[PDB]
Amino acid sequence: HMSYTWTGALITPCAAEESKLPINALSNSLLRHHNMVYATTSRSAGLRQKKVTFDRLQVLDDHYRDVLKEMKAKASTVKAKLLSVEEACKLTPPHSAKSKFGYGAKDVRNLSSKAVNHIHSVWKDLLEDTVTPIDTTIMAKNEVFCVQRKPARLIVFPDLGVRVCEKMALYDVVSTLPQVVMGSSYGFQYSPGQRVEFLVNTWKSKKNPMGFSYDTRCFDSTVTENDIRVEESIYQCCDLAPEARQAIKSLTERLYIGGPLTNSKGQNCGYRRCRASGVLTTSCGNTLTCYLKASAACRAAKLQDCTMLVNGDDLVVICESAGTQEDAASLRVFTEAMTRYSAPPGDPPQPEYDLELITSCSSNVSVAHDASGKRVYYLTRDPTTPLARAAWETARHTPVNSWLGNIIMYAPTLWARMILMTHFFSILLAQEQLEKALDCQIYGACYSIEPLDLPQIIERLHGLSAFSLHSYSPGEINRVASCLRKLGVPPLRVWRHRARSVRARLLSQGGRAATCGKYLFNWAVKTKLKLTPIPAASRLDLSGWFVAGYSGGDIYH
Numbered sequence: 001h002m003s004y005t006w007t008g009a010l011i012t013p014c015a016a017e018e019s020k021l022p023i024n025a026l027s028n029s030l031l032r033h034h035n036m037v038y039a040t041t042s043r044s045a046g047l048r049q050k051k052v053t054f055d056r057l058q059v060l061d062d063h064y065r066d067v068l069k070e071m072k073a074k075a076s077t078v079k080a081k082l083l084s085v086e087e088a089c090k091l092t093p094p095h096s097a098k099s100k101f102g103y104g105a106k107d108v109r110n111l112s113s114k115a116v117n118h119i120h121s122v123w124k125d126l127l128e129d130t131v132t133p134i135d136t137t138i139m140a141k142n143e144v145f146c147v148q149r150k151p152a153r154l155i156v157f158p159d160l161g162v163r164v165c166e167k168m169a170l171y172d173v174v175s176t177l178p179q180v181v182m183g184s185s186y187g188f189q190y191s192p193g194q195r196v197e198f199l200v201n202t203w204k205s206k207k208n209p210m211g212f213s214y215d216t217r218c219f220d221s222t223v224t225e226n227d228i229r230v231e232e233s234i235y236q237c238c239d240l241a242p243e244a245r246q247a248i249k250s251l252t253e254r255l256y257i258g259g260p261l262t263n264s265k266g267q268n269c270g271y272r273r274c275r276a277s278g279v280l281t282t283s284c285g286n287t288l289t290c291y292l293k294a295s296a297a298c299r300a301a302k303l304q305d306c307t308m309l310v311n312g313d314d315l316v317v318i319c320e321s322a323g324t325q326e327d328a329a330s331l332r333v334f335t336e337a338m339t340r341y342s343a344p345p346g347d348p349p350q351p352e353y354d355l356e357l358i359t360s361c362s363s364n365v366s367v368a369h370d371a372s373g374k375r376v377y378y379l380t381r382d383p384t385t386p387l388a389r390a391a392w393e394t395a396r397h398t399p400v401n402s403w404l405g406n407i408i409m410y411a412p413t414l415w416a417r418m419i420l421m422t423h424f425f426s427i428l429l430a431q432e433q434l435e436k437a438l439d440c441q442i443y444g445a446c447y448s449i450e451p452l453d454l455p456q457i458i459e460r461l462h463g464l465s466a467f468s469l470h471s472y473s474p475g476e477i478n479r480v481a482s483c484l485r486k487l488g489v490p491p492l493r494v495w496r497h498r499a500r501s502v503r504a505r506l507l508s509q510g511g512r513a514a515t516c517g518k519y520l521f522n523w524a525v526k527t528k529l530k531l532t533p534i535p536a537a538s539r540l541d542l543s544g545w546f547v548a549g550y551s552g553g554d555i556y557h
């Protein structure tokens with residue numbers, strides 16, 4: 001029951017890859033320890049192949065089937081619709097990988113006759129054949145990190161015509177089913193502010209709270225044929241059109257269960273028998289499976305009043321403590337049950353008794369004060385990876401601007417406000433690119449955002465307090481300051497000095513640029529302005545934001 005079989009053919013790149021941090025005239029103003037930053041390339045794909053390849057054994061008990069029966073009962077209340085070809089076409093990212101059949105993502109988006117005719121033939125083939133394995137491309141992802149080197153992660157995706165078909169059959173399912181099945185435990189329905197609120201309320205709801213995060217080692221490869229057929233049985237509980245039931249059965253049998261792996265040069269690399277990382281159902285499938293195995297493992301471990309918070313393969317559990325030593329034994333039983341379900345741990349879970357010490361989705365809860373001095377909980381993270389990625393993005397244009405996603409999602413943080421905002425607004429001002437729409441990702445979905453709209457977006461997600469937070473925790477300040485020395489980033493005092501200049505430069509431009517100066521950099525001046533709601537913020541169409549997760553799902557809004 002191997003996750004993969006391999007032929008020995010290499011996982012090949014599509015273009016020239018860089019691993020060393022590119023340097024330009026702006027690099028040193030952000031980060032001096034250049035050797036600390038690197039990008040993963042296809043060159044390390046061979047090491048990843050070794051890591052993701054293993055036998056999976058599954059032992060399914062009554063706790064597993066009990067939880068699954070409960071999930072199916074909630075899934076049976078979902079009604080889902082088929083998207084038209086045109087609706088699914090418009091969800092395609094403009095720079096999505098081109099089809100092998102003579103058309104690209106722009107042809108799909110423009111509803112070109114050639115693209116639409118091929119998509120209709122792919123749809124007809126899904127309905128008429130529910131057996132033939134569908135071809136997939138295997139590629140090494142190019143992602144940036146700080147040292148202490150990770151081998152490249154792999155992406156496995158079917159052809160563009162198939163991806164549009166996945167959307168038609170399952171977009172509405174993967175968008176609506178997880179919240180119905182898991183209720184408040186589904187993490188992707190929350191903005192960062194709502195996530196904090198859920199975590200704090202859950203922690204407060206326990207007499208003696210204990211919490212842990214569970215890290216499954218190589219989650220996609222732990223996903224078995226059983227798991228994928230179980231996911232399909234959940235999707236089939238929905239009230240669906242008969243053509244959608246047939247397409248979902250066909251996509252499960254031909255694509256989701258497994259299939260051949262083809263490199264960028266057209267060679268057969270091998271065969272997958274686990275979760276594909278680049279399909280529409282990756283996020284929803286991972287969330288349902290992680291929640292199912294974890295809920296059953298919570299029952300097997302006799303964990304008391306377990307509240308789960310699940311986002312794909314990321315899991316946080318908050319429960320009632322039975323004292324430190326019993327909690328430690330309980331987590332070892334939880335881990336044993338997860339292992340039997342084919343979800344073994346990477347790092348062993350650690351019980352926590354301070355909400356701020358739990359790391360989930362690479363983040364933790366922290367506290368600052370608003371302008372009235374009131375304590376305000378917000379989400380932050382170690383800024384090492386956002387800063388290494390910001391350094392790369394300082395010298396190279398990339399398809400996804402992590403700096404923009406990080407300013408949006410981490411706007412209340414000390415590090416996103418003082419460093420990311422200051423640095424990228426300085427660069428954009430100098431290039432007169434404040435109005436240029438840039439691509440970023442939020443919960444795996446692609447968005448095209450104009451940096452000039454950042455004050456309005458931040459206000460809608462985090463509220464006006466994101467522009468007034470101060471008196472950050474000693475722990476948070478020290479982690480940020482430690483990260484800056486480690487990477488050779490100028491200290492916060494330099495950033496405050498630079499921000500006064502950036503703020504003045506933005507105010508000089510007037511209009512939307514002045515609003516950026518006013519709201520984003522009010523922290524930098526001694527004579528603070530009283531910030532009031534932005535009228536443009538109410539007009540923002542933030543629908544489609546914080547509904548579901550779409551990592552690897554080829555979704556654009």
Ligand SMILES: COc1c(/C=C/c2ccc(NS(C)(=O)=O)cc2)cc(-c2ccn[nH]c2=O)cc1C(C)(C)C
Pocket residue numbers: 187191192195282283284286287311312313314360361363379404405406409410441442443444549551
């Ligand atoms: C839910 O946690 C997040 C997440 C979580 C993302 C996430 C988590 C798990 C997975 N797993 S999978 C492959 O199986 O779908 C996939 C994506 C992402 C961001 C984020 C940061 C910057 N730019 N874009 C973003 O989406 C911020 C937060 C916080 C702030 C709410 C903690």
